[PDB]
Amino acid sequence: MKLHELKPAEGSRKERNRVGRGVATGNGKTSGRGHKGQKARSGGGVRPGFEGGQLPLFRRLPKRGFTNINRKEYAIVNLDQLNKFEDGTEVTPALLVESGVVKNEKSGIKILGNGSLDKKLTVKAHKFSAS
């Protein structure tokens, strides 16, 4: 890189298509023919003449939702929990420790809502916690 010998990374960057500049180019109708390849061009947005983006409806929603840490809690050293917001977890509406993997440590699982299998494995090692 010597500023008069700049060379952009291989396979990045490719010349934009320019429609409507000639015929040999392969684009002078530009594209379409006769139809609504007119300028306004509205297809409609997503439709035919028979609306199938609608059949019936099913819905509701209340407040809830937690944040999952799997029994791959076997990363950290010993004792403690919730602190690991400084190690490996980010946004938490509330922090639940699920099962999955297989525990390899003895440590306090101070958290809100413990998944059952995970509780059996964490307790099979040593520590447990709640709230």
Binding site: V46, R47, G52, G53, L55, P56, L57, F58, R59
Partner: protein
């Protein structure tokens, strides 16, 4: 402008890639077809996700 989400897709919910969908003829005229009636079950799109693609898509 961020595209507006279609709100008439309060009618599907994202699976993993594919959208789970409502069905058929629930409510009205139940006086007809009986094995038909046990068609409480899901859907997707296939041919149609091509059409509806980016509208129910801030539904991630």
């Amino acid at each position: 402008p961020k595209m507006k989400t279609h709100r008439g897709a309060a009618k599907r919910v994202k699976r993993t890639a594919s959208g789970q969908l409502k069905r058929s003829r629930a409510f009205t005229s139940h006086l007809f077809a009986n094995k038909s009636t046990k068609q409480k079950r899901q859907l997707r799109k296939a041919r149609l996700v091509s059409k509806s693609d980016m509208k129910r898509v801030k539904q991630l």
